[PDB]
Amino acid sequence: EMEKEFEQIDKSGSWAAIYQDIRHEASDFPCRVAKLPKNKNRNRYRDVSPFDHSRIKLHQEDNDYINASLIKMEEAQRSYILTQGPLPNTCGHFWEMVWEQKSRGVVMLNRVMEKGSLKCAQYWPQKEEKEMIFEDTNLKLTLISEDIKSYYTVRQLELENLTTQETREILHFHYTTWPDFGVPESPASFLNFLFKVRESGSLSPEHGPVVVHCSAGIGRSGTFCLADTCLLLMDKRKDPSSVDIKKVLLEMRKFRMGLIQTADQLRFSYLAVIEGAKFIMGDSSVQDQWKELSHED
Numbered sequence: 319e320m321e322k323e324f325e326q327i328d329k330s331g332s333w334a335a336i337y338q339d340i341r342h343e344a345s346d347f348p349c350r351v352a353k354l355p356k357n358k359n360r361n362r363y364r365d366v367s368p369f370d371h372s373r374i375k376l377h378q379e380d381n382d383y384i385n386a387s388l389i390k391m392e393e394a395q396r397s398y399i400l401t402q403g404p405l406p407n408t409c410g411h412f413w414e415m416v417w418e419q420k421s422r423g424v425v426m427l428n429r430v431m432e433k434g435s436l437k438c439a440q441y442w443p444q445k446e447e448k449e450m451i452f453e454d455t456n457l458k459l460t461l462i463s464e465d466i467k468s469y470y471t472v473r474q475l476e477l478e479n480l481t482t483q484e485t486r487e488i489l490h491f492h493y494t495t496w497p498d499f500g501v502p503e504s505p506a507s508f509l510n511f512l513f514k515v516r517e518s519g520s521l522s523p524e525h526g527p528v529v530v531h532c533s534a535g536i537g538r539s540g541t542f543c544l545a546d547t548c549l550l551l552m553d554k555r556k557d558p559s560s561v562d563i564k565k566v567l568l569e570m571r572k573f574r575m576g577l578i579q580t581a582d583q584l585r586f587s588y589l590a591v592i593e594g595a596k597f598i599m600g601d602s603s604v605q606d607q608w609k610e611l612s613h614e615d
């Protein structure tokens with residue numbers, strides 16, 4: 319039971335060993351396609367690659383490779399696509415993936431520049447009057463509107479398949495204050511953001527899997543997905559005790575390596591789930607409380 323385990327591990331200050339045990343037991347599968355010579359410039363980090371069995375394949379004959387993984391949580395019945403921050407040459411691929419996979423939401427947990435480096439390409443239009451055209455994948459992207467909060471921004475985008483002229487609305491949830499290798503300011507600010515993704519309908523099973531990214535697509539992205547999945551499992555059975563967080567994280571790691579980068583991110587996952595459990599089990603005041611405590615205004 320998480321809350322008891324959390325107090326136990328915090329009392330004995332052994333989050334490092336607990337987290338390290340996860341790394342020791344994590345699945346290991348081949349990433350041969352990602353390591354092919356021709357795909358070197360399609361990877362942001364040499365040591366972060368998608369496993370071949372769960373990698374997202376672009377629908378093209380030339381080169382179907384993108385650094386992205388389909389995290390399919392069978393029991394929870396929710397899927398996520400975790401990918402890297404798009405590179406200057408893979409933004410077309412990124413949106414091609416969004417289109418072909420029928421995703422409605424894109425969750426971005428990093429800033430373009432962090433600690434003096436470029437963690438992610440500017441893959442979306444910043445101004446209405448300057449849409450973006452991706453010639454290689456033949457797609458057009460237009461900023462329709464944006465709602466800027468104190469620590470996150472929600473943008474409404476229009477993605478067009480130039481080949482068929484079909485258009486789709488994509489919601490972009492940009493979390494802008496989550497430090498790399500760090501944790502959110504509080505469970506409240508994190509949950510307020512998650513509940514805003516959730517309330518947009520972006521996670522509905524009627525849409526394709528939501529796309530989640532940071533820089534490498536495993537640390538902050540891993541924390542976000544673990545918390546969401548655990549809350550959903552808890553929700554489906556209306557029983558917080560039935561959720562084994564570490565077991566869920568190990569399950570997720572069968573689809574993409576490295577999920578959750580630090581022991582404190584793991585510890586934060588517990589905090590978020592435990593707090594979120596209040597809403598799941600029918601507390602109608604916490605959502606407004608989180609909103610208040612997050613100071614999004």
Ligand SMILES: O=C(O)COc1c(C(=O)O)sc(-c2cccc(NC3CCCCC3)c2)c1Br
Pocket residue numbers: 363364365366437497498499500532533534535536537538539575576579
């Ligand atoms: O999102 C965050 O909090 C931090 O994000 C990041 C990075 C960043 O934002 O710069 S780099 C990085 C990384 C790059 C190469 C190898 C490994 N580490 C290996 C550890 C063993 C398993 C395979 C990955 C981790 C991670 Br994650």
